């Protein structure tokens, strides 16, 4: 629904992000869908270019995860990557940041399948959207 989107792909040339996706095997924590949803959340919150970064990415991915995934454990694995070494008591103020992001998008986390596929309909050549799980 908007043609720029280029500031969002910039995150995936980043190191910690790339290694984070390499860490992801079966696409449990980051699905090609969840990485689309993490973008939809960026639009809904109306982020600036200054506002897309590491923390604001993981914070959205955690939300998409807790919404669309009934497996309640694996999504924790985001914490060491976002918050560094000690996330141990540093995860809660991350959670409140998630809640704030949720406050910014006006509480609609739910993203339809078609809407998810329509945001990857832009540049399908990108590698992200070739990552999918099965069974």
């Amino acid at each position: 629904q908007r043609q720029d989107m280029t500031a969002f792909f910039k995150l995936f040339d980043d190191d910690l992000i790339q290694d984070f996706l390499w860490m992801d095997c079966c696409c449990k924590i980051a699905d090609k869908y969840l990485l689309a949803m993490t973008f939809v959340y960026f639009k809904r919150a109306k982020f600036t270019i200054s506002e897309h970064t590491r923390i604001n990415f993981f914070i959205a991915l955690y939300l998409a995860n807790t919404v669309e995934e009934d497996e309640e454990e694996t999504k924790y694995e985001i914490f060491p990557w976002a918050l560094g070494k000690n996330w141990r008591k540093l995860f809660p103020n991350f959670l409140k940041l998630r809640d704030q992001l949720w406050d910014r998008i006006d509480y609609r986390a739910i993203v339809s399948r078609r809407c998810c596929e329509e945001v990857m309909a832009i540049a399908p050549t990108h590698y992200i959207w070739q990552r999918e799980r099965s069974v």
């Binding site: 449990k28 699905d31 807790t66 995934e69 309640e72 809640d99 704030q100 739910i110 399948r113």
Partner: protein, 270 residues
């Protein structure tokens, strides 16, 4: 709490929450309720965020279904009233199922009613969106007695057919005045399903033996008649209930297919 509106004449309620992170169930409840606007579903007017505490805002119905069912054991419920309630539930559930929603909890305390003869769904806390494919699913889902057999056994990627079953278990409850399958535990409750509805088989179900929890040590029970197990129902009622509860999830009647059933010829709004 509670509330009252001197203008427009409506009533709402608070239901606060409140310590290191917001619950994952509340996020689903709220996020789903904001995407669902239906006359047959409880609504969500507003949601706040303040420090230690989070309040919701809910349209206030006067009671739930249990206390209304507990209201009369002695007398029953008028069959047109039951037809209205069930038609309503099936309608709102048709709105849920058809677009990106599975409740995965249906019990009378999650069903709210009012004095104007309306009934609405509540507690989407365990609900989710099934639209996005290849997701993860817990197979402990609905509460106790209302569980579907396929989820009672091992089943992966269970579809919308799990809610309908619950409604069936609700249906009978509004008729016999009591619970349908008063299971004391898992298995158990399954064998009660086997007692009333009969022991399954590959004639009824394609993959019944291929279900992981299933072992053929199960006692074989035949299918009890629906005159004995639920007498007050008419032939149309039994006709609906029969295809409403059947072991095969692939057969089980959808919501949109329920609304047109001959049992609903007499539907009213008392």
């Amino acid at each position: 709490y509670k509330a009252r509106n001197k203008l427009t004449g409506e009533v709402v309620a608070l239901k606060k929450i409140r310590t290191e992170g917001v619950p994952s169930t509340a996020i689903r409840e709220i996020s789903l309720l904001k995407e669902l606007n239906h006359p047959n579903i409880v609504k969500l007017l507003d949601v706040i965020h303040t420090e230690n505490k989070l309040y919701l805002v809910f349209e206030f119905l006067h009671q739930d279904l249990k206390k209304f069912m507990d209201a009369s054991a002695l007398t029953g419920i008028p069959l047109p009233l039951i037809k209205s309630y069930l038609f309503q539930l099936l309608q709102g559930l048709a709105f849920c199922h058809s677009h990106r929603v599975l409740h995965r909890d249906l019990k009378p305390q999650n069903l709210l009613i009012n004095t104007e003869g309306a009934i609405k769904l509540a507690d989407f806390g365990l609900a989710r969106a099934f639209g996005v494919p290849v997701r993860t699913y817990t197979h402990e889902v609905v509460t106790l007695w209302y569980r579907a057999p396929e989820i009672l056994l091992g089943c992966k990627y269970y579809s919308t057919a799990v809610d309908i079953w619950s409604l069936g278990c609700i249906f009978a409850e509004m008729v016999t005045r009591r619970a349908l399958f008063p299971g004391d535990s898992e298995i158990d409750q399954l064998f009660r399903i086997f007692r009333t509805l009969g022991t399954p088989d590959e004639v009824v179900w394609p993959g019944v033996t291929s279900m992981p929890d299933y072992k053929p040590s199960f006692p074989k029970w035949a299918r009890q008649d629906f005159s004995k197990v639920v007498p007050p129902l008419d032939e149309d009622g039994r006709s609906l209930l029969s295809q409403m509860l059947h072991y095969d999830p692939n057969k089980r009647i959808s919501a949109k297919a329920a609304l047109a059933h001959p049992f609903f010829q007499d539907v009213t709004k008392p």
